[PDB]
Amino acid sequence: YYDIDDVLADGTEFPCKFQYDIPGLGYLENNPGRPITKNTKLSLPLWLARILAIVGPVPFVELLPPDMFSTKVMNAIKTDPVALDLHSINSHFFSLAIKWIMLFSEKELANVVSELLLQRAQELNHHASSLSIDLNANIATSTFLLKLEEMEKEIYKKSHESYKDTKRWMFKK
Amino acid sequence: AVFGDRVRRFQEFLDTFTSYRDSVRSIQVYNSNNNILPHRIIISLDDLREFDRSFWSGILVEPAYFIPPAEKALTDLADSMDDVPHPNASAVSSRHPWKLSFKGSFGAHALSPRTLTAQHLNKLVSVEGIVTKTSLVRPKLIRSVHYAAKTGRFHYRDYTDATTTLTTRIPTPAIYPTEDTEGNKLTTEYGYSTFIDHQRITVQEMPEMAPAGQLPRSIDVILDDDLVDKTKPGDRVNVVGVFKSLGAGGMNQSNSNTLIGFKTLILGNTVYPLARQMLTDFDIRNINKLSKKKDIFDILSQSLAPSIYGHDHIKKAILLMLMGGVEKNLENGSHLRGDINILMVGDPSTAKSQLLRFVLNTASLAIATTGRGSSGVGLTAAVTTDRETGERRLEAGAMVLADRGVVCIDEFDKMTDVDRVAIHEVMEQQTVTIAKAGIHTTLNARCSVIAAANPVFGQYDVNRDPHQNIALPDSLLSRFDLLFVVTDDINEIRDRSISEHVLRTHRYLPPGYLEGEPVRSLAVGEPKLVTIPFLRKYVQYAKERVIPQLTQEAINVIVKNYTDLRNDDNTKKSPITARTLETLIRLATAHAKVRLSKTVNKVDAKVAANLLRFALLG
Amino acid sequence: MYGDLGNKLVLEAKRTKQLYARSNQDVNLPMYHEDIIRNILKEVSNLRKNTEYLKEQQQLGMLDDKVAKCQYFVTLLCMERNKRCLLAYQRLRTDILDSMAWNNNGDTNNLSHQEQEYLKEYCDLITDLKSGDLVDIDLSGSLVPPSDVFIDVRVLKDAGEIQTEYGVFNLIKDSQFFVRQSDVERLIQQGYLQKI
Amino acid sequence: VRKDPITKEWTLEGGALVLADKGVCLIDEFDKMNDQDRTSIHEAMEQQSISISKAGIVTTLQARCSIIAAANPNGGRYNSTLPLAQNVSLTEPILSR
Amino acid sequence: DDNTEIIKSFKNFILEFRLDSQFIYRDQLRNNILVKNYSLTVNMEHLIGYNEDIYKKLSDEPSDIIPLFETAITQVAKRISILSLPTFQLILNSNANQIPLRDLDSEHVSKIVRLSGIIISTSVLSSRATYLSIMCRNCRHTTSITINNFNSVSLPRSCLNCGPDPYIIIHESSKFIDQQFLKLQEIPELVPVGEMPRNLTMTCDRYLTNKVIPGTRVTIVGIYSIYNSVAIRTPYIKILGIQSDVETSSIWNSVTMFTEEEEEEFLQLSRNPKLYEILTNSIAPSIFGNEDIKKAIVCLLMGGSKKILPDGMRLRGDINVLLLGDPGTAKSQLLKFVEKVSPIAVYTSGKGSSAAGLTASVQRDPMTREFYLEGGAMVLADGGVVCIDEFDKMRDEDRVAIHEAMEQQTISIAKAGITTVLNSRTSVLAAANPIYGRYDDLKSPGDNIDFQTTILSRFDMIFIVKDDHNEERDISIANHVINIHTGQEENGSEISIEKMKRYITYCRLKCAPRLSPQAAEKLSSNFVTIRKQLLINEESTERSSIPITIRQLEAIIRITESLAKLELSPIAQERHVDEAIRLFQASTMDAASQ
Amino acid sequence: MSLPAHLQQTFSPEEIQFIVENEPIKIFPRITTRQKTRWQLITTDDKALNNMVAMRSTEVVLWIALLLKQQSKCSIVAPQWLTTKELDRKIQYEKTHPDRFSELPWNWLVLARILFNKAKDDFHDPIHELRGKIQDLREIRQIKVLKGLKYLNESHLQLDNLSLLEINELRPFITEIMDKLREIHTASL
Numbered sequence A: 001y002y003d004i005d006d007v008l009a010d011g012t013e014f015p016c017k018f019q020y021d022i023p024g025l026g027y028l029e030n031n032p033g034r035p036i037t038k039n040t041k042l043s044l045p046l047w048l049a050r051i052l053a054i055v056g057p058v059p060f061v062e063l064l065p066p067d068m069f070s071t072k073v074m075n076a077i078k079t080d081p082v083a084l085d086l087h088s089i090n091s092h093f094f095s096l097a098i099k100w101i102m103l104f105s106e107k108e109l110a111n112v113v114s115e116l117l118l119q120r121a122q123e124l125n126h127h128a129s130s131l132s133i134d135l136n137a138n139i140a141t142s143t144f145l146l147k148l149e150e151m152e153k154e155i156y157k158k159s160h161e162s163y164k165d166t167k168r169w170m171f172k173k
Numbered sequence B: 001a002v003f004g005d006r007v008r009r010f011q012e013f014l015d016t017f018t019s020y021r022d023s024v025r026s027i028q029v030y031n032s033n034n035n036i037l038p039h040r041i042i043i044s045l046d047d048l049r050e051f052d053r054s055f056w057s058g059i060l061v062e063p064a065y066f067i068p069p070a071e072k073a074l075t076d077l078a079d080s081m082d083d084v085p086h087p088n089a090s091a092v093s094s095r096h097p098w099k100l101s102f103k104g105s106f107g108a109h110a111l112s113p114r115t116l117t118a119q120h121l122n123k124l125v126s127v128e129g130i131v132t133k134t135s136l137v138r139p140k141l142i143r144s145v146h147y148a149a150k151t152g153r154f155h156y157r158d159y160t161d162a163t164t165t166l167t168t169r170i171p172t173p174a175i176y177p178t179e180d181t182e183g184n185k186l187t188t189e190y191g192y193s194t195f196i197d198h199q200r201i202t203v204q205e206m207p208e209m210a211p212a213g214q215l216p217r218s219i220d221v222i223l224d225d226d227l228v229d230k231t232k233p234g235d236r237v238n239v240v241g242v243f244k245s246l247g248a249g250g251m252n253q254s255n256s257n258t259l260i261g262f263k264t265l266i267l268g269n270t271v272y273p274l275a276r277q278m279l280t281d282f283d284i285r286n287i288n289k290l291s292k293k294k295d296i297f298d299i300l301s302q303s304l305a306p307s308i309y310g311h312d313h314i315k316k317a318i319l320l321m322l323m324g325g326v327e328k329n330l331e332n333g334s335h336l337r338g339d340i341n342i343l344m345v346g347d348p349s350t351a352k353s354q355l356l357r358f359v360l361n362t363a364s365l366a367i368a369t370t371g372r373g374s375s376g377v378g379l380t381a382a383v384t385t386d387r388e389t390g391e392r393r394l395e396a397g398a399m400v401l402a403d404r405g406v407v408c409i410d411e412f413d414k415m416t417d418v419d420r421v422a423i424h425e426v427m428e429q430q431t432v433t434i435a436k437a438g439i440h441t442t443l444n445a446r447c448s449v450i451a452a453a454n455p456v457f458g459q460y461d462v463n464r465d466p467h468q469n470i471a472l473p474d475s476l477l478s479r480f481d482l483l484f485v486v487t488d489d490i491n492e493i494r495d496r497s498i499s500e501h502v503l504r505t506h507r508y509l510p511p512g513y514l515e516g517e518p519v520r521s522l523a524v525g526e527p528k529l530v531t532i533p534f535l536r537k538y539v540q541y542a543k544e545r546v547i548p549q550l551t552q553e554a555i556n557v558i559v560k561n562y563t564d565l566r567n568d569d570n571t572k573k574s575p576i577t578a579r580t581l582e583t584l585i586r587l588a589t590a591h592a593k594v595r596l597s598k599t600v601n602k603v604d605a606k607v608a609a610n611l612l613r614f615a616l617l618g
Numbered sequence C: 001m002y003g004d005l006g007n008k009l010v011l012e013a014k015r016t017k018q019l020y021a022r023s024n025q026d027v028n029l030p031m032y033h034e035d036i037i038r039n040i041l042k043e044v045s046n047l048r049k050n051t052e053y054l055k056e057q058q059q060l061g062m063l064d065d066k067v068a069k070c071q072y073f074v075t076l077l078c079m080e081r082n083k084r085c086l087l088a089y090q091r092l093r094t095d096i097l098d099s100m101a102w103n104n105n106g107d108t109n110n111l112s113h114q115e116q117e118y119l120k121e122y123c124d125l126i127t128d129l130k131s132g133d134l135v136d137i138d139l140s141g142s143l144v145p146p147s148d149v150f151i152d153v154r155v156l157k158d159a160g161e162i163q164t165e166y167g168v169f170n171l172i173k174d175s176q177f178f179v180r181q182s183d184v185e186r187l188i189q190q191g192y193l194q195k196i
Numbered sequence D: 001v002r003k004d005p006i007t008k009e010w011t012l013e014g015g016a017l018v019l020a021d022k023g024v025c026l027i028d029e030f031d032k033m034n035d036q037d038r039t040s041i042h043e044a045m046e047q048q049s050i051s052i053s054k055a056g057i058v059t060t061l062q063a064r065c066s067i068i069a070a071a072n073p074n075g076g077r078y079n080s081t082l083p084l085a086q087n088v089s090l091t092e093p094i095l096s097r
Numbered sequence E: 001d002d003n004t005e006i007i008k009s010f011k012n013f014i015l016e017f018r019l020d021s022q023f024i025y026r027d028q029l030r031n032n033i034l035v036k037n038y039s040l041t042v043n044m045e046h047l048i049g050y051n052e053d054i055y056k057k058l059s060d061e062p063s064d065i066i067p068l069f070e071t072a073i074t075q076v077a078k079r080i081s082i083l084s085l086p087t088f089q090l091i092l093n094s095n096a097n098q099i100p101l102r103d104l105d106s107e108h109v110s111k112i113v114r115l116s117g118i119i120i121s122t123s124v125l126s127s128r129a130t131y132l133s134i135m136c137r138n139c140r141h142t143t144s145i146t147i148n149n150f151n152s153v154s155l156p157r158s159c160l161n162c163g164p165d166p167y168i169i170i171h172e173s174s175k176f177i178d179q180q181f182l183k184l185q186e187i188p189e190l191v192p193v194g195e196m197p198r199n200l201t202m203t204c205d206r207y208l209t210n211k212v213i214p215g216t217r218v219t220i221v222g223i224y225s226i227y228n229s230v231a232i233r234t235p236y237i238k239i240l241g242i243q244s245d246v247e248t249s250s251i252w253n254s255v256t257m258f259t260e261e262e263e264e265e266f267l268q269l270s271r272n273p274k275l276y277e278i279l280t281n282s283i284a285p286s287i288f289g290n291e292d293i294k295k296a297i298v299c300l301l302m303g304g305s306k307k308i309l310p311d312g313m314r315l316r317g318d319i320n321v322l323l324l325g326d327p328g329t330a331k332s333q334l335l336k337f338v339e340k341v342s343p344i345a346v347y348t349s350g351k352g353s354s355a356a357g358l359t360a361s362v363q364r365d366p367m368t369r370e371f372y373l374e375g376g377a378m379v380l381a382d383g384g385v386v387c388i389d390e391f392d393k394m395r396d397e398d399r400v401a402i403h404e405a406m407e408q409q410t411i412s413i414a415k416a417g418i419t420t421v422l423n424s425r426t427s428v429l430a431a432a433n434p435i436y437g438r439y440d441d442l443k444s445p446g447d448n449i450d451f452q453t454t455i456l457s458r459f460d461m462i463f464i465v466k467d468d469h470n471e472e473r474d475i476s477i478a479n480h481v482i483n484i485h486t487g488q489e490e491n492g493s494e495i496s497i498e499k500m501k502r503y504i505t506y507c508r509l510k511c512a513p514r515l516s517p518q519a520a521e522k523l524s525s526n527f528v529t530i531r532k533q534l535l536i537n538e539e540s541t542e543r544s545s546i547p548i549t550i551r552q553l554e555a556i557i558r559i560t561e562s563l564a565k566l567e568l569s570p571i572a573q574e575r576h577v578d579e580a581i582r583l584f585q586a587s588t589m590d591a592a593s594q
Numbered sequence F: 001m002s003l004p005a006h007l008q009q010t011f012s013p014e015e016i017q018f019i020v021e022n023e024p025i026k027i028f029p030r031i032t033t034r035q036k037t038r039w040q041l042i043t044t045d046d047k048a049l050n051n052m053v054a055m056r057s058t059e060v061v062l063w064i065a066l067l068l069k070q071q072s073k074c075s076i077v078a079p080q081w082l083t084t085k086e087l088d089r090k091i092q093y094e095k096t097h098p099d100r101f102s103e104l105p106w107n108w109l110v111l112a113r114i115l116f117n118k119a120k121d122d123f124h125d126p127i128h129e130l131r132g133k134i135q136d137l138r139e140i141r142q143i144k145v146l147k148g149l150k151y152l153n154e155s156h157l158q159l160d161n162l163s164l165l166e167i168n169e170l171r172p173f174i175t176e177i178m179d180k181l182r183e184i185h186t187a188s189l
């Protein structure tokens, strides 16, 4: 509730489709102060979309399949989890996937996401373990780092700091 | 041993998915009924991965050992399916096995000509780029059939090449057998022998994606059989094939270089166009509904270049040029072009170059050229030699390349007369005549020309007459249907509006980007402004399925307008001529095309007259 | 829409958190974003006005049940989102202030008046805690386990003959001491000395 | 810049200035020089370097040569009454160099 | 026999070296293996310290000893990574005296040498053979060959009856590596008297490819070998290690290479309350005054931000500066310093330039008879600054070729059947003189400037520098120059060239600020005021030669964004708008008013 | 707040060292405290220190042993497992069984570092050989850890005989990855 990343994740826009005729809800639409007809298609933030979908018999809104959980993205995930660039797809992919799974009680997406997370964490740990050495006194690391999601970035930072602290303590003069 | 096991496994895979079996049956039925469809099947790598991980991985990393088994399995399935009663002698002797084709998602094998390295050799890859070269099509010998009169039996020989098969085999000289095993004379049966087409193309990295300060790189591709003529220079393609290595590469003692690497190229499996947007029923209905609006022209014109303030009339002219008129060729021989040419002469910083860039991006086919960057030969066609064949040929130029398209010329006045002559001929005749190195041919060049230029002094002067301001020849000027003179006038209201618009535009941020962050595929086969893709769909629909015909009322309006404009005391920035009547007719036809109307009505004539009057007398 | 200002505020909060994480030793809280919070509160007031108008219309008007329900729910959800964004931002700033207070034994222009009062009260609370049965321990002490009884230290900033509880150390700049780590731990903490 | 007869590739050749590296370049009849010709030496006479950007050749040479020039005043004879500037057709930069 | 002992010695060196309590090379090898980087960098001083005999053996016959070292590295890597992997690459670092490129001769044949030069050309990656699978035509005998890339190998001449050369390579079972060719020129300062710069052919393998771009100074460690293209051999260099002062990897990639200790040094510097003054003082410390021009150069180096609109329209983000002034103003020295400090820069003379020189040139290959495109100063200086000295000397024809490059940041070529649009995202810093060599106040500005308005409008800031004879300023300048001739603050008031270049790269790759609404309102008001003033200033006799169009508004926006980027500030406020407006008034409006 | 972020949910290496130095160790006193002032400790036992005789084996706490060693008043008896022969046997055991970990002491790395830094002349074997053996053991264990990291799941996980320092190093990554997998699985239901 007070965790910053969770607040940001809930702000992403998801496709929606109203099922009732609600005058005066134009401010959600592009134009203000006009009635919104049924079946109208628009994107709403997750915080408003989820509650409107669950509450409202025929609810107020129907959550259409997003573009982040499409067949193309699933196939790319299955084909090459490590090479897939998740940041461009979304910066809160794992959080939004967990929320979607909780909302819809589905197991195929859960399996796919679990496999993707495990296969990505393998390389994440490899990179975190990899540490530099100063002989006098990179490219792949940064290339992979550019592809990471926010949660993966946090895990990478924690693990890298732990490894660095252990190495520093071990080799302190 | 393993080959048979792989063949059986792919047979099981094909059996599990009945879509490929249905496609093969449909192809065979169509061929039997009757022009013909090549023996090729597109399979989805995702389905193969879901079915058998090992086979999918092998095809991806070791195509040489896993593709031929799949092709043999598909050929066996098709042959078992075939039920032709009488096989023709050519059919019996024909060596026409089914060839496999791939689609889906290439995770890490989706590369470009720049990223292809030695680590990717002998692997299935997808290459995206632009075609720059295209060798001539020539037949290639694979099988030879011979006849022995005394024995009365047909003997055949099979040939192989480095590029014909994925797996290496002993080279076979093309020397036709002459004698039988026992010494019997042999006669070549050309009609029963099998030849296949062969072509070599060069795919170039897209210039926009190249690194900083480095020129684009290119890779060679080999196309055989039905993929021979699927591309032309200047096309954007997505080629799937197997990266290969050929030759000794200096290994042989005859090469003393000891510093030279091997040869490399791609044996293409698919060619995926990247130009015509498929129209759905929903899209067609939306296009019709939008066209039924009275002010469709205004909305469509405004939707062009939303980031450019003003220039409404130039935007309307650009839209009409994109839609284009109707081209009529008379029996006597006279040819009347339907393309509309536009010229803009104005002061610096008037959004001419930005308009050229926008029309370059929006138009389905468009070629960009500069004044100082182009030549006469580079515009028309260059004489060159074919590597594959060693035959003197022609290379398409800017003009040729843009056939049935648009060519954008920037800095039109910074050219040379030598260069200008080519253009003059192009616009006047819409054809290219070449007389070089024993080559006599006429090239079709039917393109709309949109160009920008500056006054001789660099700033339009009202006091001086139009002739002095523009140094371009009068004959060249007369070919342009519309001439727009745009000047930068200092006015408080207009200055404030333009400054506010520019400031608002400069504050744009892209989706998914944080403030202060600088601006940096998944699958292969796969009064409100109108979005650009919808505009492209609308333009394609209108230009493809509408041919407006003239009517009497439009003719009355056109002749009235022409009579009024030509004999009027008021001066004109451009002289009136009989070409103005053709320009008016062309603009009326284009406006009729805008509305998806089979006939040209009074509204179209009025709009064309208004546009011409604005272009002439401001 | 409605939550864009709150989203921007949370983005700024994330930036502040990243700055805090990156910083090694010295941290200075950015200026309190008074303008954004003022705009958010004005938006909340506008939403309250909308809710009151909807209630009045329902009392006397042609509005029906479904429309009223949907509008009321949308307004309430928007208010909840704005409240959550504000509270998250304030909580992050308060946590950073708490860490700063604990770092000391017990500029301010960036803080607001409420935050300054909160910091003063928290420092008072820390001192009161230190005054209890844990007086023998120094709760606001070093969290690094003691390793060496005697260490070499060097004076970093000149100061007079400061009389500490353990003894008198005439801190002449550029002079080394061979003393116990416990005795001069506080001086190292304040930056007068250095372990080298 | 020329094309090499043997290798058929663009190449760089030196000039008077190059040949006079750590030496002297003597230009008799300086005032009779073409404007274009004259203007060439501007960079060389102060920066002591030659910059060439032609036919894809982007390079900078070393020209550490001193220049001694002989010139005739306008009209064929010096007019001691008029200022120096009016007696010669050279411009301010070349004179300052 | 001896090879096994050499391999054992190298393995012992790898597994036993230690300077305090870390096995440097063991840990380095493990870390490199973790990230799929099959190589190892060895410092030769450590090798000398461990055992001088090993260094003597390595130096005596490098071409025969290095492969044994690679084999030892591979064996140690297999031991350390696999619990019971292609051949690893050896990269060397040394501090030996650098031999001038021209001093390389017969005496240095087959020896490890260190030299520095300028890369002028790079080739397309080729494919070399490491593991070859071969088969005999007649008896179909399968055999394999292992090839090292060090040249003092061929297909067997006799099968294992079969004719000469009976083996044919099976390609699908072979393994290949990457190879590249480079052309290295000698530094201009090291060239002998009255001699053309000398070129040297060099080669790199595997992990040393795609490491340098043309026009960047580099230091090379390699073997001076020879290859037979009859009594002569063509010299060449086998690269063993590349050391450059420019992070080429971070320039051509969105990826950025900066150590954690660097990133935190550049943040601390940015936190300085007066970084602007430090950078202004850090440019041309030997030139007196010209503070405004130094600030303009700082803005040009930092550059603005580029925006790509959804409709496809692209907005320029580079700042161009023109210097029109009298002789002795020190414009050329400023241009030279800018060329020296910028990460990428090319210094060119207008006089000695051409249309084909400065954009791109159609060139026919002598052998293939095919036409290719070489690159010119504005392709070689992509992502940097082009210093066009003697701008006025340039012919019209040549000049006119620059417009699209400056504004649209592209090069359009339609020649010899080549139709392409190159990328040239460069900033142009030009210096020129008036028509008569001095700005004569008696004559109108139009008569003092021969430049057409079209070219001038593209320059964001125009500086009309006039030499005024003031006794106090003259004395100050004389004292400064005398102190320079007869004669290191580094106390936070100035940073060296290397640090400034690194900071410029970091800022360019990290920040791209944006204008706030207040900045936009102020900028619109100022633009309206400036245009109104220009309209008022017009005289009936002539029209303003110095133009004020939308391009000047864009230029001011770019200057403000560059000022904001200077401090790594994600947003540009009115504080930066005021400085940008002051600079514009001091340069462009100052030129126009006169 | 009260506790920094890097000390949350995990121990710093200094804390691990502090935990290690609480264990006993054998020393050879170089003075005779036993009588034929008095240590009065409240955390450990003081009987051993008081009844200390010269060149007679006695057991005390590791930190007290190091404090005595600093004064050159006691020679630390190195652990039996820290011999070249025993380390070689452990390396052989690791090599023969790629699935398990050798039964090294839970404080072998920390104790080895402490003894190498503080007690260099007490070891009977050359220090460099011991350093090499420890390095080889560490690399083998790292290979085993990397191989075993592939089985992370929403359910439990077993890592037998893994030392304290390695567990401390791996705690963040393992814990977070397993937590996220558990969260996904719970959401699936």
Ligand SMILES: Nc1ncnc2c1ncn2[C@@H]1O[C@H](COP(=O)(O)OP(=O)(O)OP(=O)(O)O)[C@@H](O)[C@H]1O
Pocket (backbone or CB within 6 Å): B307, B308, B309, B310, B346, B347, B348, B349, B350, B351, B352, B353, B354, B355, B454, B498, B502, E315, E316, E407, E454, E550, E551, E554
């Ligand atoms: N009406 C306009 N609205 C917005 N921006 C404009 C407008 N006119 C000009 N500009 C700005 O002008 C900048 C440069 O001008 P542009 O290159 O389009 O000029 P041009 O017409 O090609 O002139 P020339 O080639 O003679 O210099 C563009 O970045 C664009 O932002």
Ligand SMILES: Nc1ncnc2c1ncn2[C@@H]1O[C@H](COP(=O)(O)OP(=O)(O)OP(=O)(O)O)[C@@H](O)[C@H]1O
Pocket (backbone or CB within 6 Å): D046, D047, D093, E286, E287, E288, E289, E325, E326, E327, E328, E329, E330, E331, E332, E333, E334, E431, E432, E433, E477, E480, E481
């Ligand atoms: N303010 C100054 N401080 C130091 N040196 C100066 C200053 N002004 C001029 N000089 C020196 O004066 C000489 C002028 O040569 P320079 O090539 O720099 O001139 P320029 O301004 O480019 O003129 P030109 O138009 O004649 O080429 C140089 O040696 C420069 O060092």
Ligand SMILES: [Mg+2]
Pocket (backbone or CB within 6 Å): B352, B353, B410, E407
């Ligand atoms: Mg232009």
Ligand SMILES: [Mg+2]
Pocket (backbone or CB within 6 Å): E331, E332, E389, E390, E431
């Ligand atoms: Mg100069």
Ligand SMILES: [Zn+2]
Pocket (backbone or CB within 6 Å): E136, E137, E138, E139, E140, E141, E159, E160, E161, E162, E166
């Ligand atoms: Zn044989």
